[PDB]
Write an enzyme that holds these catalytic residues in place. Structure first.
Site, PDB file in Angstrom:
ATOM      1  N   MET A  26      94.479 105.706  95.595  1.00  0.00           N
ATOM      2  CA  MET A  26      95.081 106.878  95.087  1.00  0.00           C
ATOM      3  C   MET A  26      95.269 107.171  93.492  1.00  0.00           C
ATOM      4  O   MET A  26      95.908 106.447  93.132  1.00  0.00           O
ATOM      5  CB  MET A  26      96.340 107.234  95.904  1.00  0.00           C
ATOM      6  CG  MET A  26      96.391 107.441  97.446  1.00  0.00           C
ATOM      7  SD  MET A  26      97.997 107.696  98.185  1.00  0.00           S
ATOM      8  CE  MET A  26      98.042 109.113  97.450  1.00  0.00           C
ATOM      9  N   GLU A  35     103.449 110.540  99.913  1.00  0.00           N
ATOM     10  CA  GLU A  35     102.173 109.961 100.447  1.00  0.00           C
ATOM     11  C   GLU A  35     102.144 110.174 101.870  1.00  0.00           C
ATOM     12  O   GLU A  35     103.117 109.562 102.408  1.00  0.00           O
ATOM     13  CB  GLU A  35     101.876 108.611  99.821  1.00  0.00           C
ATOM     14  CG  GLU A  35     101.023 107.813 100.430  1.00  0.00           C
ATOM     15  CD  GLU A  35     100.865 106.390  99.649  1.00  0.00           C
ATOM     16  OE1 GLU A  35     101.335 106.377  98.506  1.00  0.00           O
ATOM     17  OE2 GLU A  35     100.228 105.408 100.164  1.00  0.00           O
ATOM     18  N   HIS A  54     105.015  99.934  93.320  1.00  0.00           N
ATOM     19  CA  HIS A  54     104.654 100.515  92.174  1.00  0.00           C
ATOM     20  C   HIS A  54     105.695 100.144  91.106  1.00  0.00           C
ATOM     21  O   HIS A  54     106.649 100.919  90.518  1.00  0.00           O
ATOM     22  CB  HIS A  54     104.734 102.033  92.021  1.00  0.00           C
ATOM     23  CG  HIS A  54     104.019 102.679  93.144  1.00  0.00           C
ATOM     24  ND1 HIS A  54     104.360 103.845  93.476  1.00  0.00           N
ATOM     25  CD2 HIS A  54     103.050 102.179  93.842  1.00  0.00           C
ATOM     26  CE1 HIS A  54     103.343 104.291  94.457  1.00  0.00           C
ATOM     27  NE2 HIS A  54     102.684 103.413  94.671  1.00  0.00           N
ATOM     28  N   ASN A  68     101.531 108.008  92.184  1.00  0.00           N
ATOM     29  CA  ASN A  68     101.091 106.715  92.101  1.00  0.00           C
ATOM     30  C   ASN A  68     100.472 106.607  90.786  1.00  0.00           C
ATOM     31  O   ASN A  68     100.003 107.289  90.045  1.00  0.00           O
ATOM     32  CB  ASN A  68     100.060 106.954  93.296  1.00  0.00           C
ATOM     33  CG  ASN A  68     100.345 107.429  94.600  1.00  0.00           C
ATOM     34  OD1 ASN A  68     100.617 108.427  94.705  1.00  0.00           O
ATOM     35  ND2 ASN A  68     100.455 106.503  95.418  1.00  0.00           N
TER      36      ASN A  68
HETATM   37  C1  LIG Z   1     100.237  98.023  98.942  1.00  0.00           C
HETATM   38  C2  LIG Z   1     100.226  98.511  97.313  1.00  0.00           C
HETATM   39  C3  LIG Z   1      99.543  99.863  97.388  1.00  0.00           C
HETATM   40  C4  LIG Z   1      99.548 100.609  96.144  1.00  0.00           C
HETATM   41  N1  LIG Z   1      98.938 101.636  96.196  1.00  0.00           N
HETATM   42  C5  LIG Z   1      98.498 102.333  95.107  1.00  0.00           C
HETATM   43  C6  LIG Z   1      97.751 103.649  95.112  1.00  0.00           C
HETATM   44  O1  LIG Z   1      97.000 104.094  96.085  1.00  0.00           O
HETATM   45  N2  LIG Z   1      97.513 104.281  93.780  1.00  0.00           N
HETATM   46  C7  LIG Z   1      98.436 103.700  92.535  1.00  0.00           C
HETATM   47  O2  LIG Z   1      98.165 104.608  91.508  1.00  0.00           O
HETATM   48  N3  LIG Z   1      99.035 102.854  92.718  1.00  0.00           N
HETATM   49  C8  LIG Z   1      99.115 102.092  93.669  1.00  0.00           C
HETATM   50  N4  LIG Z   1      99.735 100.857  93.702  1.00  0.00           N
HETATM   51  C9  LIG Z   1     100.270 100.151  92.407  1.00  0.00           C
HETATM   52  C10 LIG Z   1      99.005  99.832  91.762  1.00  0.00           C
HETATM   53  O3  LIG Z   1      98.568  98.707  92.157  1.00  0.00           O
HETATM   54  C11 LIG Z   1      99.803  99.073  90.403  1.00  0.00           C
HETATM   55  O4  LIG Z   1     100.627 100.168  89.897  1.00  0.00           O
HETATM   56  C12 LIG Z   1      98.654  98.559  89.180  1.00  0.00           C
HETATM   57  O5  LIG Z   1      97.800  97.585  90.169  1.00  0.00           O
HETATM   58  C13 LIG Z   1      99.619  98.027  88.215  1.00  0.00           C
HETATM   59  O6  LIG Z   1      98.572  97.498  87.075  1.00  0.00           O
HETATM   60  P1  LIG Z   1      98.703  96.522  86.071  1.00  0.00           P
HETATM   61  O7  LIG Z   1      97.751  96.543  85.207  1.00  0.00           O
HETATM   62  O8  LIG Z   1     100.223  96.910  85.526  1.00  0.00           O
HETATM   63  O9  LIG Z   1      99.108  95.027  86.819  1.00  0.00           O
HETATM   64  P2  LIG Z   1      98.455  94.270  88.013  1.00  0.00           P
HETATM   65  O10 LIG Z   1      97.450  95.432  88.629  1.00  0.00           O
HETATM   66  O11 LIG Z   1      99.618  93.883  88.809  1.00  0.00           O
HETATM   67  O12 LIG Z   1      97.442  93.141  87.334  1.00  0.00           O
HETATM   68  C14 LIG Z   1      98.477  92.051  86.657  1.00  0.00           C
HETATM   69  C15 LIG Z   1      97.214  90.869  87.008  1.00  0.00           C
HETATM   70  O13 LIG Z   1      98.101  89.728  85.926  1.00  0.00           O
HETATM   71  C16 LIG Z   1      97.797  88.370  86.858  1.00  0.00           C
HETATM   72  N5  LIG Z   1      98.928  87.758  86.420  1.00  0.00           N
HETATM   73  C17 LIG Z   1     100.389  88.013  86.113  1.00  0.00           C
HETATM   74  N6  LIG Z   1     100.796  87.142  85.584  1.00  0.00           N
HETATM   75  C18 LIG Z   1      99.863  86.165  85.020  1.00  0.00           C
HETATM   76  C19 LIG Z   1      99.894  85.003  84.326  1.00  0.00           C
HETATM   77  N7  LIG Z   1     100.901  84.380  83.955  1.00  0.00           N
HETATM   78  N8  LIG Z   1      98.687  84.279  83.935  1.00  0.00           N
HETATM   79  C20 LIG Z   1      97.740  84.968  84.306  1.00  0.00           C
HETATM   80  N9  LIG Z   1      97.467  86.064  85.095  1.00  0.00           N
HETATM   81  C21 LIG Z   1      98.599  86.696  85.596  1.00  0.00           C
HETATM   82  C22 LIG Z   1      97.953  88.936  88.115  1.00  0.00           C
HETATM   83  O14 LIG Z   1      97.740  87.737  89.011  1.00  0.00           O
HETATM   84  C23 LIG Z   1      97.411  90.152  88.521  1.00  0.00           C
HETATM   85  O15 LIG Z   1      95.805  89.957  88.767  1.00  0.00           O
HETATM   86  C24 LIG Z   1      99.748 100.064  95.150  1.00  0.00           C
HETATM   87  C25 LIG Z   1     100.362  98.791  94.832  1.00  0.00           C
HETATM   88  C26 LIG Z   1     100.589  97.961  95.856  1.00  0.00           C
HETATM   89  C27 LIG Z   1     100.811  96.657  96.408  1.00  0.00           C
END
Ligand SMILES: Cc1cc2nc3c(=O)[nH]c(=O)nc-3n(C[C@H](O)[C@H](O)[C@H](O)COP(=O)(O)OP(=O)(O)OC[C@H]3O[C@@H](n4cnc5c(N)ncnc54)[C@H](O)[C@@H]3O)c2cc1C
Length: 498
Positions: A114, A353, A439, A477
């Site tokens: 989303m 949602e 989130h 989201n």
């Molecule tokens: C079931 C579920 C449904 C969701 N649905 C939605 C939706 O439909 N739309 C929406 O807007 N959001 C949704 N979200 C939230 C969204 O996925 C997150 O807000 C977003 O992925 C965050 O992005 P980010 O870049 O902060 O971190 P993340 O996407 O969490 O990525 C961080 C990455 O860093 C890696 N990592 C962490 N620590 C270390 C380390 N020490 N060394 C190396 N690698 C590391 C992780 O393994 C991971 O791959 C959903 C989340 C979940 C779990």
């Protein structure tokens, strides 16, 4: 060895960062603790579905679990598994469980796709130091284009059995005077139409989403990351977990990194140094690295705002029991298409949602993930005994969120003469799940722990790019906001610093 720029993680912030660094000609190494998800498993598929979970489902657990809301129907398919570098990690704190993706693409692998912009008036309230015009005129539209956001065909939506569950909720909300909105997605809705017609392999229509989608979903490995790899300047190393960060005597950074295999065995501990260091490990991951570095003395000049300002985006789950004459359907797409928008920036705001039920039989249940405006925040503190960041958050801090959600759904119950379900979330009679987060937001808040472009206070050439920057709430989201903020920030950083 040495690489000019290192990006930790491969989620939304990190993917933006690496693409733009590569385009600028900067040799960039991404470190990702999880796997690259491109190898067929024992069923010939990359990912497991929600009806056939296996070790691929879970990050280092010994038993599969049912997705929240679905225990009553899906516990029957749970099994014991070997601890494995699977895709979905449930991180348990004392009074909060956070769900995060692990792998190349981060949460894009496991999310519902989303792709929603926040309301401008709320963006202005939450981040008053940021120029909102440039975000809405330039960086949001860049994000949407690069993410491959697309819109459902409304005629198909009205007719298909796969979205009956959404239509039933739209009608019920309508009776209470509440409006619904179509929500854009990164799942290809054209592909979805073809699934329904039996023309291409099913994914959304085969009960896949939370452990990955074998087809259809444009996760970051297909979009930003593919583009970054295409610059020739970006490399990704997988099963490499960054543990510590320090500043070298001359102002670069050195990282200690553990290389593991997919069974969790330590293969090597490596030291990598760089000039520019970008954290994209997510709200939990980036915050833990920085709180560890401050409190163990490796980055002693970090400020007291590192760790603060965490919130779960007001996430509450609830469910309604429909009348017998309002079935939701045995066939429900795994990708939500509609939300209820009752967000007016007041304390009673909710954006909900309309979630599918993965049971594959008629349950009469309507499931919702509500996003609320709850001012309570938690703090990450470092535990030197276990070498982990611990989240100081208590369940009572979610009371405002539960009350806001309850007020909205009581209105819908009253208009329709329905009741809640109380038995979906485990033992207690509980209509509102208040101890989970999908989130996570905050921990390294923009303008507090960092400057207004994510440059971490106290340090040069040290940047945070991810959901840790957002102050606990965005009202929708969050991944489009993360992506757009990262676009804004990296453009500035590359022009001014690199
Ligand atoms: C079931 C579920 C449904 C969701 N649905 C939605 C939706 O439909 N739309 C929406 O807007 N959001 C949704 N979200 C939230 C969204 O996925 C997150 O807000 C977003 O992925 C965050 O992005 P980010 O870049 O902060 O971190 P993340 O996407 O969490 O990525 C961080 C990455 O860093 C890696 N990592 C962490 N620590 C270390 C380390 N020490 N060394 C190396 N690698 C590391 C992780 O393994 C991971 O791959 C959903 C989340 C979940 C779990």
């Amino acid at each position: 060895g040495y690489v000019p720029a290192v990006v930790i993680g491969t989620g939304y912030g990190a993917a933006v960062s690496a693409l733009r660094l590569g385009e600028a000609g900067v040799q960039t190494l991404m470190l990702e603790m999880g796997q690259l998800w491109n190898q067929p498993g024992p069923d010939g598929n990359i990912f497991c579905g929600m009806l056939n979970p296996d070790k691929r489902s879970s990050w280092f657990k010994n038993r599969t679990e049912a997705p929240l809301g679905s225990f009553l129907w899906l516990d029957v398919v749970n099994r014991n598994i070997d601890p494995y570098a699977g895709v979905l990690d449930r991180v348990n704190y004392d009074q909060m469980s956070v769900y995060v993706g692990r792998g190349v693409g981060g949460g894009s692998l496991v999310n519902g796709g989303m792709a929603v912009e926040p309301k401008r008036s709320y963006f202005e309230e939450i981040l008053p130091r940021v120029d909102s015009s440039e975000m809405y005129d330039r960086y949001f539209p860049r994000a949407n284009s690069m993410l491959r956001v697309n819109h459902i065909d409304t005629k198909w939506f009205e007719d298909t059995e796969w979205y009956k569950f959404a239509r039933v909720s739209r009608e019920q909300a309508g009776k209470a005077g509440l409006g619904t909105v179509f929500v854009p997605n990164v799942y290809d809705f054209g592909y979805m139409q073809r699934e329904a017609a039996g023309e291409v392999p099913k994914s959304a229509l085969a009960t896949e989403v939370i452990y990955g989608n074998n087809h259809g979903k444009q996760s970051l490995d297909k979009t930003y990351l593919a583009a970054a790899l295409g610059t020739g300047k970006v490399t990704i190393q997988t099963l490499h977990q960054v543990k510590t960060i320090r500043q070298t005597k001359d102002g670069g950074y050195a990282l200690t990194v553990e290389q593991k295999d997919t069974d969790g065995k330590l293969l090597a501990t490596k030291e990598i140094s760089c000039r520019y260091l970008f954290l994209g490990a997510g709200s939990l991951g980036s915050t833990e690295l920085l709180v560890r570095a401050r409190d163990t003395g490796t980055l002693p000049n970090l400020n007291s705002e590192v760790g603060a300002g965490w919130g779960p985006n007001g996430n509450i789950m609830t469910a309604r029991a429909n009348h017998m004459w309002n079935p939701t359907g045995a066939h429900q797409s795994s990708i939500p298409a509609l939300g209820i928008d009752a967000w007016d920036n007041s304390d009673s705001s909710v954006f909900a949602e309309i979630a599918p039920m993965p049971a594959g039989l008629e349950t009469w249940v309507s499931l919702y993930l509500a996003i609320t405006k709850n001012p309570q925040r938690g703090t990450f503190v470092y535990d030197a005994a276990t070498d982990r960041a611990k989240l100081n958050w208590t369940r009572d801090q979610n009371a405002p969120a539960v009350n806001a959600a309850k007020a909205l759904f009581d209105r819908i119950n009253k208009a329709n003469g329905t009741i809640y379900r109380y038995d979906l979330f485990g033992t207690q009679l509980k209509a509102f799940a208040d101890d989970f987060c999908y989130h996570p937001l905050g921990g390294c808040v923009l303008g507090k722990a960092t400057d207004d472009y994510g440059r971490v206070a106290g340090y040069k050439n040290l940047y945070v790019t991810d959901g840790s920057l957002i102050p606990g709430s965005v009202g929708v989201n969050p991944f489009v906001t993360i992506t757009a903020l990262a676009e804004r920030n990296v453009e500035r950083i590359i022009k001014q610093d690199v």
